[PDB]
Design a protein around this ligand. Structure first.
Ligand SMILES: *[C@@H]1O[C@H](CO)[C@@H](O)[C@H](O)[C@H]1NC(C)=O
Ligand SMILES: *[C@H]1O[C@H](CO)[C@@H](O)[C@H](O)[C@H]1NC(C)=O
Lengths: 13, 238, 179, 165, 178
């Protein structure tokens, strides 16, 4: 049960 | 309820899957599958309580597939049948896993051949009682003859006036071979009644033979030798 | 070995609904139920092979919500036309009378990602043996969704999948019979 | 009709030969139209439309961000592949084949992956119509291959030897 | 007088047999009837000579030979019922019948699944009966004291191409059907 990686949502403005 | 197993008989060519069904007594969660060969040697195969497996061997794990789905008959399926799977598959049920008081069902007589090419239904003929016997003993004996069937998966019953009968009946212990040199088989049974009863035209005699064959895929000129009933009749003459 | 993993996420107004799901070669791996804040695996057997911290999903969403307000102000709130879905119904396997089966209602090529689906057996809504999938991503900018119905095939029952969306004039209804 | 506002983002990991050649593609869509991309092969943000320009301006001027972004091919894409390669990539579900006349029909259902070959039989390249590959949405596919009028053969990665009628 | 044979008959679905009437004199013509559960005498045939086919049934008659026959093929549940034959002697105007043949068509249970359920009364949870069901044609049922156990009977859910047997008892459901 390894942990899955994901992209953090970038900030706009 | 009493452990119910179907089909009572079964036949499959090498490589084919052979599935078997089993219904346990009413309220019996624990389920057993054993295997008995012609040498009367038993072998535990697998064990279930409800859905979950309690134990199994290394063969059943690789070659067999077993389930006990909720609200559904437990099943046991071979994935690639071999001539060595030919055996009697007994399924039992128990009320309590801590209790060994097992009740076995009828079972499934599985046979595995090279090809389903030699599967032939039986030809059934009834033979009327001899005038000789009727005068000499005042009893009438009918004889039924199932012949040319293969394999030896048959169920023979006598029916009189729309009812099955057992009194005055006896069936050959085992089907013999028409030619001991594989073979096509033959089986016979006797029903005996009082001459009077026989002489009554209001009486109807019928020898009914259940045959267990294919279901399935058939590729040959003749009709598909499916599981069927072959029957013969005879009438009370005076 | 040619494959494609897709992290799909979004936030929608004014419905105030977001989504976070992963996609492998076109099939959902999992998504995150924001309300309960936990990972929901498409198939149960997956849980053994992996794990995902749902917190990160909610985090992303919050940022999505943020960005959305940024995008609204940047386009003067300029609205856009809605895209009506294409509904289709079909069994999962061949249909045999008395042999349990599954009806699959397939909503496709639509946006925004918000619809109401109603299963109908003989004209009456079904709330038993009904499943659904979250809005799945397509190659393009449009969405995709599945609805499932457990049923016993009979000649007496007839089914309808009713799909309501802001791109349609009236609720859409695809029919299905054993005939 | 009714106005709607959607902020939609797809972060795509592409694998051409497993971990051999990996490509990251971040896609940003406003409403129904995409406006911004980040292609790992370009290494920089690129607006797809007028609307995506402001972001590209802002983010591309963030050196450490672009830096972290370029790395995500490995820190995210690769990382995930080695995980999924254990259960998702090598997933095999054996198809169920059935032949019946409505026009003969070959029903190939409940199988994964979607790579599959269904042939009618000598083989017949004429009078063949199929529904095409159909995704069930539960990691299983199905298809109907029908012959206008016999043998149906099926080959699939989950089958060492082909399946017939 | 008319000697009809046999007295009774049990046929599994899709099986076939034959009935026979023998006459003690010249008959003008012969008729075959079937009395269905609802005791109505359905007219199957009339013939004064030769043979006639009416679906799965076909009858033949021979006045000189003083006999008649009825053949069933591909039996169906709907065939169950007591069959009679009737004829007028050319001597008078009155009709004569046979003793009749009680026909019963046994159904083929594909997937047996016996089980005994208990059912509550829809008006009061006070009353309840026992339903033994989904067994195969082989099985039989017997009758103690204030314990009633109906005979068996088969119903047909056509929409699902399904058919099942059943029996009821009333007076615990575990001991009811021993
Ligand atoms: C694809 O990857 C495998 C293993 O990484 C490698 O052995 C093979 O050469 C690659 N194929 C191509 C097209 O280069
Ligand atoms: C879907 O149904 C809900 C509740 O019935 C309703 O509030 C909403 O407007 C519907 N969405 C549409 C019309 O697409």
């Amino acid at each position: 049960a390894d942990l899955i990686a994901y992209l953090e949502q970038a900030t706009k403005g | 309820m009493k452990v119910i197993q179907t089909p009572r008989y079964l036949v499959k060519g090498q490589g084919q899957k052979a599935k078997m069904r089993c219904i346990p007594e009413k309220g019996h969660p624990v389920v057993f599958w054993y295997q008995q060969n012609k040498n009367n040697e038993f072998k535990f195969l697998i064990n279930f309580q409800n859905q979950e497996v309690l134990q199994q061997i290394d063969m059943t794990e690789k070659r067999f597939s077993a389930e006990c789905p909720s609200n559904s008959p437990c099943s046991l399926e071979i994935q690639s049948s071999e001539a060595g799977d030919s055996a009697l598959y007994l399924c039992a049920s128990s009320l309590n896993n801590a209790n060994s008081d097992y009740t076995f069902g009828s079972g499934t007589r599985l046979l595995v051949i090279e090809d389903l090419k030699n599967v032939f239904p039986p030809e059934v003929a009834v033979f009327e009682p001899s005038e000789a016997e009727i005068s000499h003993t005042q009893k009438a004996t009918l004889v039924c003859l199932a012949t040319g069937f293969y394999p030896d998966h048959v169920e023979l019953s006598w029916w009189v006036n729309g009812k099955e009968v057992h009194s005055g009946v006896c069936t050959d212990p085992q089907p013999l071979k028409e030619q001991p040199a594989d073979s096509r088989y033959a089986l016979s049974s006797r029903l005996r009644v009082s001459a009077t009863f026989w002489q009554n035209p209001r009486n109807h005699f019928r020898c009914q033979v259940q045959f267990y064959g294919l279901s399935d895929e058939w590729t040959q000129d003749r009709a598909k030798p499916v599981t069927q009933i072959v029957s013969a009749e005879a009438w009370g003459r005076a | 070995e040619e494959h494609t993993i897709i992290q799909a996420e979004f936030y929608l107004l004014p419905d105030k609904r977001g989504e976070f799901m992963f996609d492998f070669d076109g099939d959902e791996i999992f998504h995150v139920d924001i309300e309960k804040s936990e990972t929901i695996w498409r198939l149960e057997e997956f849980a053994k092979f992996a794990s995902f911290e749902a917190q990160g999903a909610l985090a992303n969403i919050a940022v999505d919500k943020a960005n959305l307000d940024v995008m609204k102000e940047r386009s003067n709130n300029t609205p856009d036309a809605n895209v009506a879905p294409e509904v289709t119904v079909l069994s999962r396997s061949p249909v045999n009378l008395g042999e349990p089966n599954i009806l699959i209602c397939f909503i496709d090529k639509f946006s925004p990602p918000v619809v109401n689906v109603t299963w109908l057996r003989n004209g009456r809504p079904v709330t038993e043996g009904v499943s659904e999938t979250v809005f799945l991503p397509r190659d393009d900018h449009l969405f995709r969704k599945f609805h499932y119905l457990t049923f016993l095939p009979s000649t007496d029952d007839f089914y309808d999948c009713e799909v309501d969306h802001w791109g349609l004039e009236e609720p859409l209804r695809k029919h299905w019979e054993f005939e | 009709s009714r106005p709607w506002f959607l902020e939609y983002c797809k972060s795509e990991c592409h694998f051409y030969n497993g971990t051999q050649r990996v490509r990251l593609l971040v896609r940003y869509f406003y409403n129904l139209e995409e406006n911004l991309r980040f292609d790992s092969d370009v290494g920089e943000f690129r607006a797809v439309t007028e609307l995506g320009r402001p972001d590209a301006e802002n983010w591309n001027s963030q050196p450490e961000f672009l830096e972290q972004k370029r790395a995500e091919v490995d820190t995210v894409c690769r990382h995930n592949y080695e995980i999924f390669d254990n259960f998702l990539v090598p997933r095999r579900v054996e198809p169920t084949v059935t032949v019946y006349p409505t026009l003969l029909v070959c029903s190939v259902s409940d199988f994964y992956p979607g790579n599959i070959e269904v042939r009618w039989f000598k083989e017949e390249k004429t009078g063949i119509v199929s529904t095409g590959l159909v995704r069930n949405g539960d990691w299983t596919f199905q298809t109907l291959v029908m012959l206008e009028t016999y043998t149906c053969q099926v080959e699939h990665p989950s089958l060492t030897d082909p399946v017939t009628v | 007088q008319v000697e009809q044979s046999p007295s009774a008959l049990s046929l599994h679905e899709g099986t076939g047999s034959a009935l026979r009437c023998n006459f003690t004199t010249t008959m003008r013509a012969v008729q075959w009837f079937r009395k269905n559960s609802r005791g109505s005498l359905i007219n199957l045939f009339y013939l004064a000579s030769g043979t006639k086919e009416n679906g799965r049934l076909k009858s033949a008659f021979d006045s000189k030979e003083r006999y008649s026959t009825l053949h069933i093929r591909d039996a169906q549940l709907e065939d169950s019922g007591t069959y009679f034959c009737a004829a007028e002697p050319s001597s008078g105007q009155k009709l004569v019948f046979g003793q009749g043949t009680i026909l019963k068509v046994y159904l083929h249970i594909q997937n047996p699944d016996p089980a005994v359920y208990q059912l509550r009364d829809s008006k009061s949870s006070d009353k309840s009966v026992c339903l033994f069901t989904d067994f195969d044609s082989q099985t039989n049922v017997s009758q103690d004291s204030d314990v009633y156990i109906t005979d068996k009977c088969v119903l047909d859910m056509r929409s699902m191409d399904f058919k099942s047997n059943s029996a009821v008892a009333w007076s615990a459901c575990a001991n009811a059907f021993n």
